[model samples]
Structure formats: structure tokens, C-alpha cells
Target chain A: MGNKLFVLDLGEIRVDENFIIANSTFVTPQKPTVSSRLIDIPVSAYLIQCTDATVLYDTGCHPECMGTNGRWPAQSQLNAPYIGASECNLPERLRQLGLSPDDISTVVLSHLHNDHAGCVEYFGKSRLIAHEDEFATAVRYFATGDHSSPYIVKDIEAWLATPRNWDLVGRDERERELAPGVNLLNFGTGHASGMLGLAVRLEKQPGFLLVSDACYTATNYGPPARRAGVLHDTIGYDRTVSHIRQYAESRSLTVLFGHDREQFASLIKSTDGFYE
Target chain B: MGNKLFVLDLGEIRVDENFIIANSTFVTPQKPTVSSRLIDIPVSAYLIQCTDATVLYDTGCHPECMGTNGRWPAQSQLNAPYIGASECNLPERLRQLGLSPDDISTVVLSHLHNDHAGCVEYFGKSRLIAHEDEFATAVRYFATGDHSSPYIVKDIEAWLATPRNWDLVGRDERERELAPGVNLLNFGTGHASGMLGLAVRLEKQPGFLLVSDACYTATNYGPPARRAGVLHDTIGYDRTVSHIRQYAESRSLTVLFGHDREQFASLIKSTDGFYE
Candidate 1:
């Protein structure tokens, strides 16, 4: 059984000012003073290649987000400016690896935020898999424009028009052998409706579990302060974290975070390109 | 028994271009071109004034948060950037009401994240109230640059140095009457360790409860998605949300979210004088 996961470093996306608050002042203060910083970190996505099937994980954000229509401050900064997407786009990168949109057989989406699912239309023939509740919530989110609704109008329209397959997994610790020795486990953690952590077992290498925004940064994984800025279900998120930790420990698996630029940098970067 | 609560809408913050993703042929058949936007909403803080005691509920983010050091994306276009402490700060806002920070006899903090505790130093003479577990977690958070540490340092340090009255509440539901007809009830939820919601009874009006980030927006409270992004304990957070909902229903108390800018706007504006 041969399995390979191709991870890509999509060029950085510039977030709105209010997007990333420092660890310090994100929470409200009892007394008031001023202290803190604004910053940018790389966004990442991964592609997993099994002998007969191809799967893609989390996707990065969009390019136009740098400006006002998508800007941070509502009033004063009327024309919120945005930095365009980086040089590397996911499709172009994958093309370099000799793979086409039609080649991917499955897409294990981390969650349905526009950035993560924006490119879903390209996989029109693949089976899209996610937590059951999340799929339902996403449908409602698209219709109502809810906060957790990450699906853009165009993308949602495209998804509805495309006849694709979808797998709604339950929120639990369940593993399915997708192809041969490539087992995909769903560790439910609620960042969005149906957040999942994926574990893949390579024949000879150590098993790896990708924690998609379960803990955004590596610091979050290690008993650090909670990032309270945006949360749908704090309880579900925490339980998932605990569950992942226990599962990781029990399985002696290598846990990878969804968007920790620092950690991603420390790991291997692929030159052969996207895993498809 | 007279009571007043002041709520302020501190503006927005965000991150950069590293967020977007391009479609990948190697991954899924979904179009490889997709983008994402991470936007942080404006926060709302409250200052509560009772018949005999003054309590500040939560503090908004620091003024320096407008700059790059605050982790805002470099490309971020901010609205009116926060200017540090002065007439615009919370203490000044309090002063406008003919009161001083020292006049704030008690400070019932929702959590210890810096945004919530930013102005604690101003209340050096007041009793600081929080959950013991939250305090312990805050201590660790500050000591270890655990994300929320930097922004919260100065004020938390000031509070620790002066050693003003500190009341660490237990994790159970109980009422403590701080003033005539003013009761403070603790309802625990888990965005953080020992997260607590407050119920206050005023004269002539129905009692009101401040449900801080227990639920980001009203959507989380009434949802198919009952999960939050981060929680110290998921089960606890969920149980608390349900319990609070039931409690509020039983008492018909008006519940206030700690950080809903829309809700805050509906009530009052910062420039329109202050709440008393």
C-alpha cells in the first residue's frame, strides 16, 4: 500500500484589521487601557494521495478579501483596502503536478467556510464528505447569510447546480478505510458546525491526524489561553480538543494543525507539488 | 434601587492575504480558486452602576489594537484606529458620568482575557471578582505568553501588584446581593474555564442577565449549531447555555450579550453621552 500527502503553501492572504487580535486584548477588559498587535500568518491546504483515490483537505481564503466590501471597520475605514492573493494559487499549483480537477475522487472538507470550500466547484465529480450536522447548518447558512456561513453566493450556486456526491459522517470517533491501508478517521471538534480532525495511516510511516482549526495555532494545542474572538460552540470545540489529545496519545499519532504557519514551516514542503 | 449599564462598541480588526486558496487539480475536482475572509467584529463592553456599588462588566479591546503590533494583517484597512487612554478610554467614560475608577466598588469580570480585563488597573481600589479557576488560568496565560498574555499584562500586573480586594467565586449558581435590590447571580458557561454569566435584578424593571461571549451572537443561542469555537470544557459550556436559557425563560429576564455590536447600537451610542 503506497500513500502520499501533498501539502501546499498557498501564498499569504491579508486579513482585515479586526480579523486577528493578539493573545492579549481579544477578550473584553474589566478596566480599560490600550495594548496589543495586528499580524498576518500564512494560510495552508493539503492534498492526500492514496493508491487509487485522491483527497483534498482545508483550502485557503480568497484574494478580494483585502478590501472594504470585505473590510474590518464598518464606518471610518470606508474603503478597507486588501492585499491580493499571493503568487501561488491552489489550482495552478496542482496543475504543475500533472493532476486535473477531474482526477480527484474525494474531498474531505475540514469545514464549510468560504475559504475552505470556495474551490469545491472544481471537484464536481468527487464525493464531498463532512460532518452531518455541519452539512445541514451550511445549507441553512447559505440561505440566511448567517455568521458561520462561509459559502459564498456564487460558490453555493455552483455547488447546487453541480451533481456531486456527498458523505455526511456522524460526530464521533470513527475510522473508515478509504483505500487499502489509508484509513481516514473523523475526530469531531466543533469550530464550525461539523469540524473534523483527520487521521491517515501510512503503511510504514507514523500515522498523522490533521486537526482542522480544532486548535488554530500549536500554542492552542498545548494548554494555552482560549481564543474567544469567534466561536459557535465553545463546548463542542473544547470537547473535540480533549478527545483529539486522548486519541493522539493513545495512538501515538503525529497531530498536525490546520493553519499554524510556524509549524507548517518547520515541516517538509513539497516540490513535486499537489498530491493528486 | 437604581441601576445603569454602559456599553461601548470598540471598532474592528483583521488579518491578511494569506487566507485565500486557488483551485487544485491534484486535490479535489472543485475549482481550485477559492478565497477566504477572516473578519473580527467590533466588541461591546458594559459598565454597570447599582444603587450602592459600581461594577464594570467587560472592557473592549485596547486602542493600540489598531496597529500592526496587535496582529492585524499588514494589509488591513482599519476604521478609526483606537487611540490610547484619555477622555475616550473607559475611565474617562466613567468620569463623564461624574464617577472615578476608584468609585467602581466592585468589578465582576466575565473572563480574564485582556480585552475584558484591559482597564483593571483603573480599579485599583475596587474589589475584583472572577472565577477562581479563571483567575488561575489567567495567571498561567500571562506567565506563559499564552496568546492572551501580552495584551492583558499591564493591567493584570497592576491588579496583582496593588492586591486590591479579590473575590474568587465558586463554580455553582448563587446570588450575592451587592446593594439594595441588586442581586448578582452566577451562571457558568465554558468559553473559558469557569466562565460565568451574571443576572442582575433592578427596581421597577424586570431583572437582566449579562451573557458574555457564552454565545457570540443570538444565532448560537437559538441554533442548530449549539457549539462555540473555543471552550475550556465543552460539556460545561453546553450545559450552561441550556441552563441559562431555561433560567432566563423561568424568570423572563432580558439577557444581554457581552459583544453584540448590533445589539449595542440598538441600545446606545458611545458619543451620545454615556449610560448612567
Candidate 2:
């Protein structure tokens, strides 16, 4: 029991296809080739109990996104909403696992996407480890209050340089251990710009490769690589997915997609259930 | 190892006596009976690990209060500026104790004063337990933005009545178990409207009775009984202190004042140390 990994169903997010490939090179308006599709994405976070420390990987949406009652902070609102996830939010999921906000020794952000970092404030006691580029980009967005995206300025302010913040981006794109069996692999992939992949070494089953936003779905990582329209860097997306496939296959690991609803539904998942 | 208590120094708060006694009846403006005294109140949060859960007692000032560069939020900022506490703040304090925000299962708030509730957002994954009356009063203040006196309305909106909120206060004046050995004794005394007293059963030393803001210092709880000067109900304050003295005496427990500079200095304290 030196290393263990638990998957949490943060929630379900409903968004348009543009979100999937907003930065994709092929989604351009000059030619109406990309068809619009509403994709129901399953958002999730991971918990790692290893190396004498407990770590949290990514946090979901703002707890109040479902019903704001018009009290939503004007600049702090996200477009995605949860469906059938009334009590399946991050905190609820943690409670079921006998964990709390204070148990998280580390919170590894996949990126600064609103869906990924909305709950960052909840882990103020945990060391917030994120790619330096990603965190820097989040800081830049905060400078412009007018900007709106999956990133929140408030979450950035939660742990920035405040002793809890950690920039683990390594030497020569080096991978680092977030907990024990948890390694931070910089895939340099994101619909946003920079992405950090979490590779968990498990005991009871095969290892887990969390390729956040590297590939949207199994289809995104198709035998015939298709252009993922929603993106921060289209070219970056290509390299990320390509490397992820090789990495997972070579290691015989389970590659978890970022927002892949089709794959997410197929996987064994629940707030009470976890992959160890 | 069954019961553990850790004191976290949130930081230091600088305020005038008027701020402390804003709601006190004796501090009147008609004839100026109160003398001005500026003091630096050391703010702190507590952690209790027992029975089946881990509880956090009060959160320190807003994490950004110290290094705000004057960018602090108008309504959320505390009077105390972070001085010499670059590393000793609440979150770091927990980190040094080998605990993280995710590790906390319950968060017991003595009251919703900004200094106490500033980091409430950090424990969204834990059950939020607070004095019923104090919480209710804070909620009422949010209805009107004109209110002041160290209660951050923004924090109230974050979790109050939202899905993540849970109140542990009972119907009649009663004591309850926050974890196992951790007892919540309703002193009904507050520098603000209402206060909750925490009684922890300690084996290494005497039991701890955390009377947050009910009694500011040793002088406030003096056998010579001096006015705390700050209070929501002076009569309630008188009764609370009397009962605390009797209760602590009967139990042969150590009486801990809320903000006593003299006592705080004498105690063996550190974020890394635990009273078991």
C-alpha cells in the first residue's frame, strides 16, 4: 500500500463543440467545415495517497455554478453547468472517501481552465503545484478583468507565492513527483497553452496516465489523428496527443482523457467508487 | 495518538479598541468613557484530530492580507497586516504539521469575524460548523453591504446556504462533539454577537478551553474581572466568563483566553508542534 490512486467524479459539464477546439486550426470561419455539436463532458479530479502524503489533482467547478440566484460575481462566472451531479461535486466526493480539505497535502493543477481550477481555493492548505507557464498565463488573464475563460483570477490569487504555491516545472521538461507514486509529466499540451500530465503508479491495477486536455477523447486520439477544435495551441495539441499515445502504450497504462464523455461513461466511476 | 490538537498562528492583526468594542454597549460615544488603545491581536486557527474526524477551528485572516501590495479586497481585508508571518500563516501552519486543507473533515468557526472566517473558503471540502447565531448574524449583514467591523460578506456568499454548507449548532444552548474529544460549548459570549467555546480533552497537558473572543485576554477573564471592552452583550459576557471559570475549575482544565498576549507568549507553541 505504498501508492494508491482514487478517481473522483467532480461533475458533468455541458458545452458547445467550440470549447473542444476553440483554438483548433481547422475550426476557422473562412470555411464552414467544422460542424457545431453540444458535447457533454465529464469533469473529474484525482486523489493520490502515496509517499506518506495525500495529493489532490485538479478541482472542479465553483460549488455555486448550478444556481447562482443572480449573485454570481460578474467577472467570476463560468459557462459550464453540472447535470445529474447535484451531490457529486468535489467536496461531496471527498467526504465519501473519508477525506477533507485539510488532508490534501498537494493539489496538482492540470491547467488553469475554469473547470480544472475553479475549486483551487478549497485547497489553500495544500501545496498548489502547476506548470509555471500555465500559472503565469493565469496571472496575465487576471491583469485584464474584462477577459473571461475557463480560468478564474480569484483562484490564482488563492495560493500565488503565498507559501502554498509551487512551480514544479522541471529542468529540461523534467517530470517531478507530486506525492509519491504521482509524477508530474509536462506534456506541453492544452486547449489553453501549457498542460501537465499526471502519471500515477498503482498497485492493484495498471498505472493511470492522466492526459489532461491533451486529447479530448478516444476519437481525439483516433487512429487517424483528427483536429481537436477547442484549443489554446493547435500545434501543441498535436504533439501532446502523439506523445501521450506513445507513453501510455509503452507503459501499458490507462490513458484518461480530459473531457471525453464517451470514454468517461465507459469507465467505472462514481463518488463512492474509486480506482485504486 | 487518539486525540491531537494543533494551534496555527494565522498572523497578527492591528486594530483600535473601538473596532473590538464596536458592538459593545459600554463603549459609548456620547461622553467618551472608553480610552483608545491600539493593540496587535495575534490571530490563530486550531486543528483537532480525534475519534473519526479532523476538525479545523477558525481560519486565519485572508491568505492575501499580508502581501496584498494594497490590492486587498475592500470588504474582505482584515485590519491586521501580515508582519513577520510570511511563513507562519494558517495554511503554512497546517503544512508544517503534515496536514493539508483536504485533510480537514470539519471546520468549527467560533464566529464569523473576518479574521476568523477569512479562510473559510479553503475548507469547502470539510463540514463547516459554526455558532448558529453568529453565522445567522453574518448572513443578515450580507443583505446590506453597508456593514463593516471585520465580517467579510463575500466569504458568506461563498458557502452560506450553498450546497457545501453545514451548520453544527443545536436548537437549545447545548454542547456538542466537533470530532470526538473536541467539545463545542456555547458560551454565547462574543466580541461580536455570538461566540462558541471549544473544549479539547488533552492527555499530555491539561484540557484546552478555547473561548474565542468571549474573553480577549487574561485581564478580560481576571478574578478582578475587567471589561473586554469589546462585546456584543456585556451581560452575556459576564455570565460566560463566570461559567467558564466554574466549568474549567471543576474539570481542572487549562483555561485559554481568546487573545491573551501574555499567555500566548508563555505557551510552548509552533505550527509544527501538537498537544496530544
Candidate 3:
């Protein structure tokens, strides 16, 4: 009756070991041999049912990312292609929850990365919340022909074609409560230009601090935080880790890392149950 | 009596010779010894009196850019401090031309680099024109806590505090004619996130393409253009130089470099006379 938290399993993508952890291969005096391997990580979105409004945090990658005529560029497809089933699509996932894109009152994006912002155009009726810097940086990169990694020019063009209500969070905005027991966390810059996350205070479950890409995994969430090779701001990454740790400890909230295969394996996805 | 162009000398800043010319120090078999030193470059703004309205291009650095309590960070002050007489300030220079900030109907910024956009807040009533990408990139950088060089937080904060009418040019807008004789050039991105230059078809003088930092000097505008040490987009820099050369050649326009001391010394500043 009060609040509910649902974990939507969108899909997964392939990435290098170093991208997950910077300098993963190290040769010491004792151990001289080294081998590198690629790892597949899960991409997820959260559905938060507040007292008054329904919020969806992040929209997964596009369904046609692996095909020949995919929306994502060929370079991106070769690097980190989406791997999922028909039901893994955001719209199909929402259908299982007995809701449509129109049902979502607010949609909060973690960052403007290809994976997080692919399906943002679908929810034009909802108020989209994102860090202002994230959107601007993406636009700047796309406009200036700096078609770097993780930024899809076609996706940006698609959003520009559609008229969506955007509620951009400023840098100074550390935390903002959208509804009762629902807060938006602005982790300035780390993995991306500007990263945002959500905090939900569930009626049944303990409060959860969903640190999306702020700390990618348990290895990164350590007190002596590690750096990911795919980083925007170095100092910001350390600051975010310290802040997330402090925030989690002070509030007694369970930290949900962005994409940890082991950690995600234990969670009850939306298909199975709800966390309320 | 018809249309006039005036160059307002807005102080100078010290920079390393390498900044002006990339790889200034080259030791070969022929030239075994090489020396390097800092050089002072002129900062300027242009006042364009068209048939109908008056236009101001680029604002000089803030008056409080020197001393212990300077608006710019101590690192920046020590690196490239402002050097000019009291009359070199924007308002003072404008006063020399028998005008004030309020007299300008429109103000065009080349980019949001500190020296170019310091006194932007003063033009609250004037229609300020800048590339949307430039403004967004600056705002994004400032907001994300990446207080890098050439971007002053204090200056950006001041502009944010004040109410100003900004007419931002998009990425696709290659050229926009402001008045009968003046046009704003959107040189996508090069030295900065986005660079906008002024093109004035004068009554008495040859048409001038005032490319701000797209090409700092003639050396950078060669058949095979040389790169500056300070650059935002590499390809954009080359593209801008090529475009400027083609544009000037096609229209028989005189190219006025941004901070070329040798070239600036030959021109008549506003204190002496005006170009018409």
C-alpha cells in the first residue's frame, strides 16, 4: 500500500576485464604468467512505486543493437554489443509489470551512456530526470564529431527529434526527494560525464541506495576504492566512492552496485517477485 | 556614416611560446640548440556599427584578474596573468569609443573560454549570441567539478547569477547574418568546444573574417596547418583552418587572426581610429 521496489532485468553486454577493473593483469616476482579474458555483465533498471507516483530508473539498451541494421554504430556494436532475449526489452519488461510507458510518471536516467539512455524516447509523456552535464556533454560530443565510446549519435538524434519533458539536476543538487521515500542522488562525475542514482525507502525492505556506475562492483566499493579504466573524472571517482560509502553507512542502506554478476545473481528480479 | 568596424584593445596575457606554436623546440642535426620563452598576446573585442544596431564581439578578462584576492585561481594568475593599463578593461575601452554596455544591441561570444567570456554578465540587456555547444560544455565542465584551465568558476557563477538574454546558435547553423553587414560564423569546434567568429562586410575596408581562436596566427592557417598545443578537437581544428581558407579565398575577405601580435600591431585600434 505504501511503497514497492522492483528490479527489472533488462539484459547484458560484453566488456573487457580492464574496463571493469583498471590494470587487471599484473605480473609479480612470484607469479609471471598472465591471461586476459572478456566478461559479460548485466544491465538493469528499477521500478519504484511511490505513494503517489511511479518512477522508472534507467532504460536498458536497444533490442536491435546486435543486428546488421542496428541503431548503434558499427564501432559500438563491435566493442560492446547488447545480448538479450525478446522479453529483455524495456517495453516488454514493463508489460510484465502490467504497465506501459505512459504509466510511468517519472523516468530517471543514471547517465547518458548508450545502455542507460537507449529507450528514453519511448517515455515522452513522463518527466525525464538526468544530470544536466551528462546531457550537455553528450550533445557536445555528438555535435562536435567526437563520436567516442559509449555515446551513440543516432540515439541522441532520435531524442532530439522527439519532444520529451526533461528535468535536469544541477551539480550542486546532491540529493532531491521526488516523492515520499524516493530520492534522486547526483554522483557528479565518474564512469560518465555525470552520473545519477536513486534511493528508495521501501515499506517492507530496508532502504536501498542504488549506486549506478558510481561504484560498479563490490571490488570498487572498497574503502580503498579501485579505479575503472572507463572513467571520466579521476578525483570525482574517488570522491563518489567515499560519498557512497559514507551515505550507505550513515543511512543503514544496502548498496546496490551497477553491474556485478555475482551480486545480481542473488537479487529477486521483477519476474520473480517485488521487494516490498 | 554607414557601417564602421572598431578594434578594442582589451589587455594581454602571457603564455608559453609552445602554446602558440606546438613543438616550438625541435633539435635536429642542423639546428642542435633550441631556446623557449613566454610571449605576450593581445586580447581584443570588436565593436560593429551596422546600419541599424550596434554589436560587440567578445568580452575581455575581468578587472579583478590580478592580485591576491583575484577572481581567477592562483594557479591561473601565476601561469598566465593579465597585463594591461586601466584603459584596457572592457568597460573602459567601450567608454573610449563613446559608448557603454547598454549601447550594444547584440553581443557575440567566440567561445566560453575565460578571457573571451569574462564580462558577459555586463550585457544583461543585449542579445548575447554564442554556440549552444560552447555554453553547454562550459556549464557541464563547471557543474561536474572539472575546474580545468581556461575556465573560471567565478566568471561562470556571476553570469549564472545575472539575468541575460542568450541567443544560442546550434551545431547546424554554419552562418547567421546578424545585421546588413555583420554575420556570425559557427566554426563547429576547434580551439574550444565551439568557436563563433564575426564576419563584417565594411563600407570602406575589405571584408574581414575575425576568426577568434580557430586559427590563432598565419602559421596555423597554412596549406598544411600547424596545430596549437592547446586544443579541444583535433579534427575540428584542421577542418576550421581549411574552411576559413576556402571561405576567405572564395569571398576575397581579409582574415584577422585572434592573438597574432605581429598582425595586431599593424592595425589601427579604437583609440586612434575606426575601420569603415
Candidate 4:
């Protein structure tokens, strides 16, 4: 496969059970019991590997996060439960691919939540690519400190202070290429200030649409798409989802959901295999 | 012990392995394979509980960091393994203490490195007390995007934009009090631009000195304290360590080391037990 694509399961998050379904109509029933039950939702990071250059989609939490055993920089030791993966973290997976931390020359940031950009340090030397609207919002939020915002503080610090080059893509309809056959689609604002998705053209396979958070799950992205409980704008969410579907159809690409755990299990994970 | 103080193991770091030691004279020579084996250095955060406002000293790496399954941020998913923490992360530990994130009213930030400031988000509503010198340097580095700086980008961003009160202590040598019995010593520089250490007089116990990273380990704080592998200034390192020693001597107080795992084992940990 030459390893064109790989999905890394950073670990699992214990959140409200309903959190599994985007804009959930119902996972079990109406509230009371099922609504409060905690469930396992995966936090995933993707990779775009090439013989010459290695591009990482997003980094997981700070290594120190696992607590006195893992790192927890948010507010207190009693924060949310992020059961770290015991099999292998990202680096170990990279080693399985014969790559080191420095091997990543480019990073495509989806958003600046504690999960996505928590590990911005690893790519301190690589160029970070993000949508201008999303990036600008991060900068703006850095100045405004919007409490309602869903981002961690440390990741943003790394974005600005680190020596990496920033390749902020404008919020436009067009796609950009980092390597031959690798395309990035700008899906601004849905779950975040601005989100970006990727489309890859494998040698013999159809194009692959990696919808970051713009489309949380395949069910959420169904013909009658449901909105995620957490989002920036409803219109923005629909617009981004519609665009993803339209683009997938027009290009005959297989759509990939951001957090569709059902489909998430069907696919082969990194360390085990890679998608060319 | 009423458990006035508790050490939360943020997690363990698998750095250069030798990085576990402070200013080591040799990795080998008078040694063998000991020069190159991965070792665990404890990463810790302290919770100083009191009747009124609870104070926190140094938030560990972002809770998401403990990765073998999670992706480690910065440099690479592959830099050095964070090994994450099998022990409870900061948040879970706090819950064990019967406290929530909001219960923390005060936080003393030593620096903005990924491990220390990863959890800055939890205390966004709490007053963050940091050294003006260290805080300013983090601010300045954010503007320049200095890759060499140790601070995390997101934490500084939150510091500037968040609504919480920013109580940046001045650079004078005099110490300041946070509560009736809790005092913040201005041991500026050494570990960071301007680090802060704590001295507290518990209800009935002897005085307790929380030397954040001023003196990393008991060995590092030896008759001849060795410099840590990571440092801001040589003179500042010595000056800071010396002051900690002299202050403890004058008051007959007990001093605590930062990452001295050998001694760390003897201390009371949160959740299962606490230090009163």
C-alpha cells in the first residue's frame, strides 16, 4: 500500500453516553438514565505517509496527561477520564512504520482542542497547516478567552511560540495539495471555529474523504444529517456536511466520519496495517 | 496527618532516561550498558488543601498526554515516550479528594512547559498566580514563536484571554502570602524565567516547603546540588536552590524535592490516601 493513510487510536474518552451520536435524537431512550451513563468514545489522529515526506494529521494529548501516570493539565486531577491506550501511543506506532518524531515534516491541524493540538510540541519543527478562519479564531480566542470555547490553553501556546511555519489555508471552496494526489478541503466552522477535511487519491482506489469533525459520524452525515450536540453554527454544520457529501459523490470517494465508532471498529487501525 | 498536602503523580516521563538525573557527571565510563536505557522520572503536581480556598502548585502535562495509546504532542508522536500514567491523572485524583475542578480557587503556575501548564484550562475561573518575570517571558516568546522556549503556546494564550484574575507576583526577593499561613517565595529563575515556591504552616504540623522545580530531586539539592538537564540560567539555578536551603534551615521546616522518585515513594499520594 506504500502506506498512504493510517488511523491511529490515540485512546478512548469517557463522556456522556449520548456523546457517541452526533446531535443524538436518542441512543437508548429519553434522558434520565441512559443520558447520564458514561461511554467510550475514541479520540483518533490520522497520518499521511509518503516515501519522502511524512505528514501528521493531529497529535494526541500531552504525554504527561496520563496522570501522575498520565498528564492532566486542564484544571485538576479529577477531570475527565481519558483511558490511554496501552498497546502503543503515536510514537510507538510511528516506529512500527520506521519513523521518529522528527520524521514528521508537516502537520494538518483540525482544531485546537486539548485532544487535537495537545501534542503540538512534537512538530515544533514542521509546518502546521490549518484553515485561516479556524486559525484566526484560535488567535482571537487567545485574546478573548471565550469561556464557552472548547479548547485547551497549552496547545494554543505551542502554536504561536513554536518555530514551525504556519500554512493557513483560506476559507474557500477549493482544495490544496501537500503532496501529489493528496488534497485538503476547507470545511470551515461546524464543530469548531473552522475545520478542514482531507481527500486522498490512492493508486487504484477511489478518493477518500477524511472529514475531521465537520461530519462526526456516518449516521450524522446520513441523507437526513443530524446535528452534533456541540457545534459553532447550525447552518455552518449543514453547509459543511452537504459539501462533504457533494464532493464525495462528485469524486466517487469513500467518506470517513470523524467519530463514527460503529464504522470506526470496522476499519483496520495503525500498527496493525496501513491504507495505501 | 490530616492530609494538608498531597502529591499527585501527574505521570512518569521516559526521557533520555539519564534525564532523570540532575547535572550528571557521567552516563558511563566507570559504567556499562547503564548509559542508554529508558528510565522513568516522576512528574508531579501538588495540592495544598486548606479550610478556605484550595491552592494548586504546578499543573502536570495535559491530562491527555499519558500515551502509549494516546498520541504525545510536540516534536513527534515518537520523541521520547511519556509512558503516560497508569496512576490516576490529575482530574480523577481530584475527584478522589472529593473536589471538583471549580473547587480550586487558586493556582501557582511555575512555568508554561507542556507538562506543567497542560491543565491550565481547568482553573480558567481561578486566580492564576505566576511570577511577572516568568509570565512575561512566556508572553514575549508567544509573539516571536521561539521554538527553543520551554513554554507551551496554549497556556499563555489562555493566561492572556481568560477571565480569571491574573495575579502575577513581582520579581522582588521577598515572599508573598496567598492565605493566612501559605506564603509564596520569589525564587525567580533557575527552573524557569522566574519560578515560584511555596511555604506553608499547616494547622499543627511543622512548616512545609513546596519547592516546585527549584530543587528537582534531593540529590540535585545535594551538598553540591547539580543542575537539571533542562535549565534557564546557571547562576539563577544555583541562586534559587541556595535560597530554598537557607530558608528551610532558618525555620527548621521540611523541604520537598520535585522529581526525586526515590523519596517520592515515601510520600502520601492522593485518592487511596492523603497527607493531612
Top model number, lDDT: 3
How does model 4 score on DockQ? 0.01
lDDT of 3 at A34: 34
User: In angstroms, how far off is B250's CA in candidate 4?
Assistant: 2.1
Q: Give per-residue CA lDDT, model 1, range B1-276, as digits (tens).
A: 377666655444332112111010011112222232333444556666777677777655544444556532222224223433344456656666677878778887778765566666666678888888788877775677544332355445555776677788887756577666455656554667766666766555666778776765565576453454434555566776787788778888777765454665577745574443
Residues A67-137 of candidate 2 have per-residue lDDT tens digits of 55421244333343455357657888888888888888888888887678777767656777777778778
Residue A21 miss distance in model 3 (angstroms): 23
Over 4 Å off, model 1: A16-22, A25-35, A62-87, A146-151, A223-228, A249-252, A273-276, B1-186, B190-276
Whole-model lDDT values for every prediction: 0.59, 0.68, 0.80, 0.68
List chain A TM-scores, every candidate, in order: 0.81, 0.84, 0.94, 0.85
**How large a fraction of the reference contact set does each model reproduce?**
0.11, 0.00, 0.00, 0.00
Task: Give the Cα RMSD of candidate 3.
Answer: 13.9
Candidate 4 Cα deviation (angstroms), residue A83: 56
**Candidate 1 residues A191-261, lDDT tens each?**
77777667766656666778766766666677743443344565666677788788778887778876566
- Candidate 4 local lDDT, B1-276, one digit each (tens): 322778887776655433434313121112211222344667788888866769998887766653454323454234444556555467777787787768888888876666677677777577888888877888887677664445655555655665766788888757877777788888886667788888877755676788867877887788766666545554577788889999888987788776667777887777556565
Question: Which scores better on lDDT, 1 or 2?
Answer: 2
Best by TM-score: 1
Error of 4 at A268 (Å): 64
Error of 2 at A54 (Å): 1.4
Displacement of residue A5 (Cα, Å) in model 1 is 1.7
Query: B57, model 3: CA deviation in Å?
Result: 1.0
Model 2 chain A weakest 10-residue run by lDDT: A23-32
Residues B1-276 of candidate 2: C-alpha lDDT, one tens digit per residue:
578777777667655443343212121112223333446667777788888888888887766654444323442234334443677667778788787887988888888886778777766577887777777788887778634545666666665545665675753667886666678887764366667888888887767888778777776677766655424555566678888899888887788776666677766556447788
